[PDB]
């Protein structure tokens, strides 16, 4: 979201975010299902599926998004461009 004022942009981005929602399947409601590797544009995300006791070892942004999804155990390395949106 984008505005002249910071507050406004915050609001816009919240309310707009509700509209685009994904369902993310969770194996046993903590990890993901299987190992993922993806190259999106110039970014490389590589995510490995952990056992129960191993909490969220990840780029901080990914840890955030994960706490919001409900994924409690993961490992993810990002390489190439770390640009946030991408």
């Amino acid at each position: 979201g984008k505005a002249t004022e910071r507050a406004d942009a915050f609001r816009k981005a919240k309310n707009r975010a509700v509209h685009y929602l994904h369902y993310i399947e969770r194996y046993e409601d903590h990890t993901i299902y299987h190992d993922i590797s993806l190259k999106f544009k110039r970014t490389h995300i590589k995510m490995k599926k952990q056992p129960r006791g191993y909490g969220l070892h990840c780029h901080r942004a990914i840890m955030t998004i994960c706490r919001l999804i409900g994924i409690k155990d993961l490992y993810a390395k990002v390489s190439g461009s770390v640009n946030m949106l991408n």
Partner: protein, 135 residues
């Protein structure tokens, strides 16, 4: 609220999953109707890539032996005297007559093209159709 991503999956996928997560607390009508009688294909998004290299399509061209005859008929006599009615479902043209005559003289065992052709022309002249031909 909803899921405005068109590209993610089918409307059914997104809706069902959104309900499943407890986000959408009211089930729409068209959901149950869909559940009862699903479409043939999942209406998922797909991108129309252009085709490259050697790859072509699988579409078959439509041809029958009757055509192989109609070609000769049109080469000699052109389009028939009766014009065409594409409104009439059961309409048979001059060429179609010629086709059936040729098919019937083929069942008599004549393997020569000239015999079959000229004698189907005579078998048509017998019924009273005029073939003016072309130069």
């Amino acid at each position: 609220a909803g899921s405005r991503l068109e590209t993610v999956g089918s409307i059914f996928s997104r809706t069902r999953d959104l309900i499943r997560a407890g986000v959408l607390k009211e089930k729409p009508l068209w959901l149950d109707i869909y559940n009862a009688f699903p479409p043939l294909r999942e209406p998922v998004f797909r991108r129309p890539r252009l085709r490259y290299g050697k790859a072509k399509a699988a579409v078959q061209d439509i041809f029958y032996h009757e055509d192989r005859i109609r070609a000769k008929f049109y080469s000699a006599y052109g389009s028939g005297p009766k014009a065409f009615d594409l409104f009439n479902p059961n309409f048979k043209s001059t060429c179609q007559r010629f086709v059936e005559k040729y098919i019937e003289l083929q069942r008599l065992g004549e393997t020569d093209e000239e015999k079959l052709f000229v004698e189907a022309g005579k078998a048509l002249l017998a019924e009273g159709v005029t073939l003016r031909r072309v130069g």
